[PDB]
Amino acid sequence: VLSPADKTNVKAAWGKVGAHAGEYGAEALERMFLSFPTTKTYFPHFDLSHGSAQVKGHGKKVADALTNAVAHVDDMPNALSALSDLHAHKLRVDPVNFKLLSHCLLVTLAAHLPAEFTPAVHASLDKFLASVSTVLTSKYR
Amino acid sequence: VLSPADKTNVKAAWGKVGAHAGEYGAEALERMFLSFPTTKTYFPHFDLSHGSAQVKGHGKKVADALTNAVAHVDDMPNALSALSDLHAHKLRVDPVNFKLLSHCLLVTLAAHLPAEFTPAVHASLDKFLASVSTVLTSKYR
Amino acid sequence: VHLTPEEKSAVTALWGKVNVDEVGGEALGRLLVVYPWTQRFFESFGDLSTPDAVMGNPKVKAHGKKVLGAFSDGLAHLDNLKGTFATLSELHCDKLHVDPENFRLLGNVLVCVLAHHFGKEFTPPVQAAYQKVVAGVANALAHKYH
Amino acid sequence: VHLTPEEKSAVTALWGKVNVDEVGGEALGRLLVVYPWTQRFFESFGDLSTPDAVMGNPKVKAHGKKVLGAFSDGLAHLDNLKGTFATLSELHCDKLHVDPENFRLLGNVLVCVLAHHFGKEFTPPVQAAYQKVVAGVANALAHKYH
Ligand code: HEM
Ligand code: HEM
Ligand code: HEM
Ligand code: HEM
Structure with missing residues (x-):
C-alpha cells in the first residue's frame, strides 16, 4: 500500500528535497522536541x-x-x-x-515545499512515513 | 509479526475454539456494543x-x-x-x-480459555488480531 | 491552554495573517483526503471522489469557514476553551459520535496548512505554541467523552 | 465515573473475590509481555526477557500488588477519582513521563485478566462497567498532562 502513484509522488518530493535533506531532517527534530518535550526523554x-x-x-x-x-x-x-x-x-x-x-x-x-505540498502529495508522504514507522516498530508487533 | 511461534499458539487456541467460534464472535460484538457504544453507530x-x-x-x-x-x-x-x-x-x-x-x-x-489464556498466548493472539486489523484497513493506505 | 505571552502573542499574530475564507476549507479538505474514513461524516456534501473534487466542493469550503471560526473564538478564549467548546462537544460527541482521535488529526492538519502558507515564518516555536492550542482545543471538544 | 448502582454493585461485588497478591502481577506482568516498549520503564526489575522471565519476576509481582492497591483505592472513590490519584498523575506524567495511551493499556489488560479469572462470571455488562472504571482511572492519571 504504496501504490505507484504514491511512490512517484514520494519520489518527487524527496527529489525536490535534495541536499537540504540533512537540515530538513534536523528541522523536524527540533520542531518535534519543541512541540513534544516528552520525546527529549x-x-x-x-x-x-x-x-x-x-x-x-x-x-x-x-x-x-x-x-x-x-x-x-x-x-x-x-x-x-x-x-x-x-x-x-x-x-x-x-x-x-x-x-x-x-x-x-x-x-x-x-513549509519548505509549498509548490509540491499538495493534497495528493501530502496524502502520499503520510502513507510513506506511516509505512516507515510501521516497519521501525515491527519488532514489537 | 506472527513469528512461527506466534502462528502456533494462535492455531492452537483458535483450534481450541472450534465450533464455539460463532457464539464467541457474537459475544465479542455484544461486548463491544455495551462497552463502546460509539460502535453501535x-x-x-x-x-x-x-x-x-x-x-x-x-x-x-x-x-x-x-x-x-x-x-x-x-x-x-x-x-x-x-x-x-x-x-x-x-x-x-x-x-x-x-x-x-x-x-x-x-x-x-x-473468558472461555482459562487454562489456555497464557501471557504468551495472550500476546500472540494480540498480534494476530492486530495484523488482521491492519489488512482490514490497508486501503486507507 | 497556557502559553507564555510571547507565545500567546505570536499565535495571535500569525492568526492575523490568516485568510479565513480559505484556510478552513484547505484544512477540512485535506482531512477528508489524507484520512478518507472521515468522509463518513460528510456524506451529504457531495462528490468527495477525488482530491480535486474534495478540494473544490463548496459545502466543503463553506463548512471549513464555520470550523476556522470556532478556532477563532477559541483563540480569544485560551483559558476557557472548555466552556468555549462546550456546545460543540455535545454535538460532536453525543450526536455525531466522532472519535476524539479525529480532533487531533484535524488540528494536526490545520498545522500543516499553516506551515504551508507561512513557510519560514511558521518556525518551530510557532508550531509549538500552535501545537498547544490545537491540543487544548481537541481536549475541549472531547469533554463529553469524559 | 458515573456507574449506575447496578454497575456499582456488580463491579464492587466482583472485586471482593480478587486475589490482590495475584491479580496485580498477572496484569503488570502481561502488560510488560504484550506491550514490550513498556519494559523501558522497568530496566531495574532485571530480567524481563521472556514471558517466563517476566512472570516469575518477583519485583514485577511485588509492583503489581502496588498497582491494584491504587485500583481498589480509586475504585472505592469513583465519586472523586482526581483526589485519589493526585500524586499519581505527577509521578507518571511529571516524573516518569509515561505516555497516557499506556495507562489506557494497563486498564485493558486488567480487564482481560479479570476475564481470565472469572470466566463467564465476567459478563459483557460487567465488563462494560469496569471499562468505565478503567477509563475513569486512566484519565485521572493523565490530568497532570492537562
Ligand atoms: C522516521 C522515523 C525514524 C527514523 C528514520 C530514525 C532514524 C534513526 C537513525 C538513523 C538513528 C541512528 C543510527 C546510527 O547511530 O548509526 C536513530 C537513533 C535514534 N532514534 Fe531514531 N528514527 C526514527 C524515529 C525515531 C523516533 C520516533 C524516536 C523517539 C524519540 C527516535 C529516537 C531515537 C534515538 C533516541 C536514537 C539514538 C540516539 C543516540 O545515538 O544515542 N527515533 N534513529
Ligand atoms: C476483526 C475485525 C473485523 C472483522 C474480522 C470483520 C468482519 C466482517 C464480516 C465477515 C462482515 C460480513 C461480510 C459479508 O457481508 O459477506 C462484516 C461486515 C460489517 N462490519 Fe466488520 N469486521 C471487523 C471489524 C469491524 C469493525 C471494527 C466494525 C465497526 C463497528 C465493523 C462493522 C461492520 C459492519 C457495519 C458491517 C456490515 C453488516 C451488514 O451489511 O449488515 N466491522 N465485517
Ligand atoms: C477539530 C476541531 C473541530 C471543530 C472546531 C469543529 C467545528 C464544527 C462546527 C463549528 C460545526 C457546525 C455547527 C454549527 O452549525 O454551528 C461542526 C459540525 C460538524 N462537524 Fe466538526 N469540528 C471539528 C472537528 C470535526 C471532526 C474531526 C469531524 C469528523 C471527521 C467533524 C465532523 C463534523 C460534522 C460531520 C459536522 C456536521 C454538523 C451538522 O451540520 O449536523 N468535526 N463542526
Ligand atoms: C494504569 C494505572 C497505574 C497505576 C494505578 C499505577 C500505580 C503505580 C504505583 C502505586 C506506583 C508506585 C508509587 C509509590 O509507592 O510511591 C507506580 C510506579 C511506577 N509506575 Fe505505575 N501505575 C499505573 C500505570 C503505569 C504504566 C502504564 C506505566 C508504564 C508503562 C507505569 C510505570 C511506573 C513506573 C516505571 C513506576 C516506578 C516507581 C518506582 O519504581 O517506585 N505505571 N505506579
Missing part, C-alpha cells in the same frame, strides 16, 4: 539546544535513512532492519512517538 | 438488543473470517481483500474501532 546524552551540532548531526542520519527508504521503497522491511532492531529492542521507543516525528517531518516538508 | 439496520438474532448471525460471519485468516495466517492480505474493500471503501469504518473489537475479542477468548 530519549536524548539525555544530547545537546537539545537551538543549534546542537548533535541535533544537526542526527538530522542528517535520519534523513539519510529516509532517502534510503525512499530508494528501496518496496523493500523497506529489509532496507530498515537494523534500525528496526535499534528502535524496538534497544531503545524501545513508545510507538506513539513515531506519530509525532512524522507529523513534524510533514510540517517541515510543507 | 455502524449497525443502525440491526436490532442490537441482548437477544438479537441479527447480532448472532453477524457473530458467525466474523467468527468465520478470523478463521480463514488463521488458516492463511501467512497470506491474509489475499485472504481478506474482500473484507478490506468493504470496511475501508464501503463502510469507512474508523480504524480505531478495530482496536476496540479486538480487545473484546481478547476478552472473549480469555
